[PDB]
Amino acid sequence: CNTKCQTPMGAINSSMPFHNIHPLTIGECPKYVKSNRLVLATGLRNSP
Amino acid sequence: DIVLTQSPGSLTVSLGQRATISCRASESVDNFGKSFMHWYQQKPGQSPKLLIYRASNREFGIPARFNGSGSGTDFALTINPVEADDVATYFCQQSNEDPRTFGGGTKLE
Amino acid sequence: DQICIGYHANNSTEQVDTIMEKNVTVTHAQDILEKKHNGKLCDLDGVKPLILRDCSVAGWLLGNPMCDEFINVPEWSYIVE
Amino acid sequence: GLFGAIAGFIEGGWQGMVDGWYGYHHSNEQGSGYAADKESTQKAIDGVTNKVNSIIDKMNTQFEAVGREFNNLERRIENLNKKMEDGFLDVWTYNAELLVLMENERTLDFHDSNVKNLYDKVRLQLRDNAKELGNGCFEFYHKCDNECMESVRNGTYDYPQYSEEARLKREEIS
Amino acid sequence: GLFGAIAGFIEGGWQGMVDGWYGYHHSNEQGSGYAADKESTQKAIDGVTNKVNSIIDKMNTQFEAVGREFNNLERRIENLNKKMEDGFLDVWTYNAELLVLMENERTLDFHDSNVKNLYDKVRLQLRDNAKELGNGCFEFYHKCDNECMESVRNGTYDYPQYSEEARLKREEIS
Amino acid sequence: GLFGAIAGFIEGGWQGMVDGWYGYHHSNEQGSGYAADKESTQKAIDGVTNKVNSIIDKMNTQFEAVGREFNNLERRIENLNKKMEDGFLDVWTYNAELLVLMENERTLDFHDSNVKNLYDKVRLQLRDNAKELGNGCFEFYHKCDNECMESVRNGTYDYPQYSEEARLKREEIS
Ligand SMILES: *[C@@H]1O[C@H](CO)[C@@H](O[C@@H]2O[C@H](CO)[C@@H](O[C@@H]3O[C@H](CO)[C@@H](O)[C@H](O)[C@@H]3O)[C@H](O)[C@H]2NC(C)=O)[C@H](O)[C@H]1NC(C)=O
Ligand SMILES: *[C@@H]1O[C@H](CO)[C@@H](O[C@@H]2O[C@H](CO)[C@@H](O)[C@H](O)[C@H]2NC(C)=O)[C@H](O)[C@H]1NC(C)=O
Ligand SMILES: *[C@@H]1O[C@H](CO)[C@@H](O)[C@H](O)[C@H]1NC(C)=O
Ligand SMILES: *[C@@H]1O[C@H](CO)[C@@H](O)[C@H](O)[C@H]1NC(C)=O
Ligand SMILES: *[C@@H]1O[C@H](CO)[C@@H](O)[C@H](O)[C@H]1NC(C)=O
Ligand SMILES: *[C@@H]1O[C@H](CO)[C@@H](O)[C@H](O)[C@H]1NC(C)=O
Ligand SMILES: *[C@@H]1O[C@H](CO)[C@@H](O)[C@H](O)[C@H]1NC(C)=O
Numbered sequence: 193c194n195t196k197c198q199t200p201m202g203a204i205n206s207s208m209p210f211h212n213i214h215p216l217t218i219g220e221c222p223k224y225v226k227s228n229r230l231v232l233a234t235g236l237r238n239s240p
Numbered sequence: 241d242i243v244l245t246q247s248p249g250s251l252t253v254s255l256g257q258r259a260t261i262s263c264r265a266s267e268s269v270d271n272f273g274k275s276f277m278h279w280y281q282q283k284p285g286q287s288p289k290l291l292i293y294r295a296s297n298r299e300f301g302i303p304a305r306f307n308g309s310g311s312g313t314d315f316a317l318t319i320n321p322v323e324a325d326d327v328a329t330y331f332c333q334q335s336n337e338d339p340r341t342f343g344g345g346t347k348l349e
Numbered sequence: 350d351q352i353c354i355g356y357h358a359n360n361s362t363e364q365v366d367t368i369m370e371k372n373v374t375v376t377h378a379q380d381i382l383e384k385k386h387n388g389k390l391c392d393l394d395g396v397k398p399l400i401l402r403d404c405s406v407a408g409w410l411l412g413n414p415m416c417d418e419f420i421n422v423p424e425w426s427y428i429v430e
Numbered sequence: 431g432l433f434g435a436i437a438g439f440i441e442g443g444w445q446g447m448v449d450g451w452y453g454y455h456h457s458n459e460q461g462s463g464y465a466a467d468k469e470s471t472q473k474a475i476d477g478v479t480n481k482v483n484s485i486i487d488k489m490n491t492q493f494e495a496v497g498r499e500f501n502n503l504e505r506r507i508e509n510l511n512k513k514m515e516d517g518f519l520d521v522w523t524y525n526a527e528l529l530v531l532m533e534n535e536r537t538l539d540f541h542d543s544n545v546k547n548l549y550d551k552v553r554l555q556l557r558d559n560a561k562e563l564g565n566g567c568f569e570f571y572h573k574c575d576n577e578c579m580e581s582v583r584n585g586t587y588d589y590p591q592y593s594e595e596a597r598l599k600r601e602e603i604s
Numbered sequence: 605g606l607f608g609a610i611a612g613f614i615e616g617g618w619q620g621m622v623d624g625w626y627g628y629h630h631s632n633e634q635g636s637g638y639a640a641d642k643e644s645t646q647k648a649i650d651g652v653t654n655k656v657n658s659i660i661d662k663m664n665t666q667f668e669a670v671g672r673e674f675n676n677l678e679r680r681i682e683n684l685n686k687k688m689e690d691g692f693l694d695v696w697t698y699n700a701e702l703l704v705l706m707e708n709e710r711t712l713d714f715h716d717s718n719v720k721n722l723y724d725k726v727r728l729q730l731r732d733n734a735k736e737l738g739n740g741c742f743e744f745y746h747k748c749d750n751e752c753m754e755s756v757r758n759g760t761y762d763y764p765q766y767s768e769e770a771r772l773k774r775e776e777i778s
Numbered sequence: 779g780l781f782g783a784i785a786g787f788i789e790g791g792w793q794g795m796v797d798g799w800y801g802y803h804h805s806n807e808q809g810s811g812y813a814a815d816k817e818s819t820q821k822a823i824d825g826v827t828n829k830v831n832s833i834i835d836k837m838n839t840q841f842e843a844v845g846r847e848f849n850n851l852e853r854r855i856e857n858l859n860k861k862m863e864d865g866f867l868d869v870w871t872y873n874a875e876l877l878v879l880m881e882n883e884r885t886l887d888f889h890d891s892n893v894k895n896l897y898d899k900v901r902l903q904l905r906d907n908a909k910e911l912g913n914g915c916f917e918f919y920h921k922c923d924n925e926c927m928e929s930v931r932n933g934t935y936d937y938p939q940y941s942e943e944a945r946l947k948r949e950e951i952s
Contacts, residue, residue, distance in 0.1 A: 193391035202386030215495035235377030358443025543780035
């Protein structure tokens with residue numbers, strides 16, 4: 193294959209700014225944070 | 241589908257004079273920061289062998305007389321000097337995306 | 350006759366977190382985290398890496414007779430051992 | 431909901447409102463339906479999109495772990511390197527989680543004000559002409575056409591003319 | 605107080621209110637006293653308790669200093685270790701202080717909205733029936749029993765019936 | 779502007795107001811001009827100045843880079859020192875930028891509430907006597923002197939006396 197970023201456990205196809213695969217990454221690709229879930233809310237809270 | 245046009249069709253240089261071979265591409269064969277065009281040489285009655293890979297780097301075992309430079313759509317290969325053990329047919333190959341295509345060949349007289 | 354004020358509503362069940370309460374549902378949620386990988390190990394920017402199968406830097410540089418496939422190796426992106 | 435616009439006054443969302451985020455529901459003689467005002471939802475879109483980029487833009491500079499190796503006779507340095515690398519990751523994963531947690535609260539509260547202020551200006555325009563029911567509903571007096579609803583929608587509500595017919599309607603019910 | 609509920613409209617707290625956080629004071633023919641509404645103070649308790657746990661839960665992962673020793677001939681490494689260990693503590697003590705400082709402001713402002721919105725719904729229910737004095741007091745017209753006070757307390761205030769007696773009381777004072 | 783006081787109700791600032799931050803404009807028989815109330819602008823000055831010092835006071839303890847040198851045979855340690863020093867600077871420059879970014883929003887929102895609450899108390903004092911135009915203007919009924927404007931300015935507005943003349947003015951226009 194051919195990936196812009198490579199990690200010891202595989203490789204990343206994305207443009208997101210975060211990942212939690214491995215810290216020792218090579219290439220220009222998202223940074224590493226040890227979190228399970230990171231979401232940004234872009235809408236109203238819905239009663240339904 | 242890059243189509244490779246290589247000129248001159250037949251090159252003739254005596255011993256010791258620079259020999260310039262060139263070929264052009266339809267769109268740019270440069271991606272990811274490095275131009276992906278490889279130079280091949282096929283001696284008569286022999287299988288082709290790699291001379292220049294990625295249009296700049298030279299394979300080990302190939303004498304330093306072979307020089308390749310280029311950028312964008314045009315690439316050139318120069319040989320300094322030229323002796324009797326240089327007659328062959330040279331091809332330039334692109335690998336930006338499949339299918340791979342070859343040049344029309346060039347006899348070196 | 351009547352006129353009132355209102356806001357967009359949706360039937361989506363996207364879950365977002367906040368400090369006051371961990372579970373709140375919103376109409377539109379954007380996730381920024383990559384947890385999936387292809388699982389392979391291929392080249393970076395078109396140049397194949399130097400994949401040392403069994404011998405290591407000491408073995409390859411010294412020329413271990415077990416691995417003679419790593420002599421005259423071309424340009425690489427990274428070394429895998 | 432600190433401002434109280436979400437729930438509070440208006441506790442029920444509109445599933446039929448897909449054109450935009452904030453809008454008005456009109457129920458008059460010339461039918462009924464949902465309509466949107468662009469000046470409110472466009473600023474929310476621009477503000478939220480700027481916030482989303484800001485999280486990415488600010489997080490551009492971060493610690494990048496690199497591999498270092500030691501020869502089994504220098505373990506104090508290896509422990510020092512190991513504690514430094516994961517220590518920086520622990521610091522940076524806290525900043526990312528705290529930033530996401532706080533900005534989630536901002537967006538929900540930012541949306542509260544926009545719909546709250548949208549209600550405030552409609553009350554401030556209608557004033558004595560309409561009555562406040564409690565769920566965001568306004569019941570005005572004049573028997574005008576649907577264009578008056580659009581007049582409320584472009585925020586151009588001229589008061590005087592409509593006052594006389596409404597004050598004739600404030601004296602017939604009293 | 606950004607929302608202005610604390611001080612502002614109501615600048616005097618109730619020392620006799622120990623049952624809960626937010627409540628109503630009734631002064632009618634059937635005596636007087638203080639009473640509480642559970643739906644407001646319970647959400648504040650749950651929200652604050654969740655915040656208190658969140659500070660503890662988020663701070664679970666932190667740098668832990670460990671002892672390393674050197675042999676008086678390697679002082680660059682010892683200085684590197686010393687500056688790294690106290691540097692991480694300086695970073696983490698700033699996050700803890702900043703988090704505490706900001707969340708203190710949140711709780712005070714969160715309490716402002718709850719009592720402010722509690723006032724808003726009572727005004728929104730009573731409306732024309734009562735008059736707004738300025739210190740949060742409402743003086744309604746109808747001569748109903750203490751159950752009507754409880755009706756205000758369960759947020760179930762039916763308007764129409766009470767309107768006729770009140771409008772007979774809006775015309776006798778005018 | 780979450781509270782909506784800036785823009786919203788009052789979208790035009792006063793360039794002639796240089797005495798203070800928040801004030802009242804009076805247009806009566808005894809001329810016209812701008813005047814200030816100290817109790818509102820003084821608290822804003824004290825609050826903002828405390829915030830400005832707090833940024834400086836909290837940032838007193840920070841990482842301080844120091845020079846260390848190595849002998850070209852120990853590059854793992856030199857790389858470790860280089861990544862540690864600039865890593866701490868990257869962490870601290872994010873805290874400073876994030877703190878400045880958030881506190882800028884606080885000051886703008888803090889100023890929103892002060893002018894909003896300043897409007898709220900004037901409406902709460904005038905009440906039925908004046909009419910709400912929409913741009914923060916109040917048009918009262920009684921034909922009193924400029925001292926009544928000062929009475930509004932010291933927050934001491936006695937209601938009863940002014941009610942009778944105003945209610946005689948609520949019945950002549952009706
Ligand atoms: C992963 O890397 C690829 C490049 O190898 C990125 O390009 C995306 O590749 C996919 C697969 O071919 C494209 O999907 C295709 O879209 C066309 C319409 O343009 C559709 O006709 C095909 O049937 C197929 O679905 C995709 O368009 C292309 N671009 C994007 C923006 O996705 C890909 O973005 C990388 N990421 C992912 C998550 O795939
Ligand atoms: C809030 O959301 C979290 C995340 O989904 C919920 O946690 C899940 O709960 C279910 C039900 O027991 C489990 O099967 C999942 O494994 C949980 N996932 C995670 C990531 O913890 C949680 O239940 C929701 N509600 C509350 C009150 O926290
Ligand atoms: C090849 O020639 C180019 C210019 O024609 C020059 O820039 C380059 O240094 C030469 N390469 C080698 C290996 O001599
Ligand atoms: C949302 O999904 C539910 C799922 O049952 C459906 O009943 C409802 O009609 C949907 N609403 C809209 C607006 O599509
Ligand atoms: C919408 O509001 C603008 C405000 O200037 C006004 O020019 C326009 O006439 C309004 N639309 C209609 C249909 O009146
Ligand atoms: C309290 O409010 C609830 C709301 O449904 C109502 O059922 C109940 O009757 C109220 N209490 C009394 C004493 O009326
Ligand atoms: C200003 O307000 C204070 C409030 O106690 C009052 O004592 C004073 O008389 C007021 N100023 C004037 C000129 O009345």
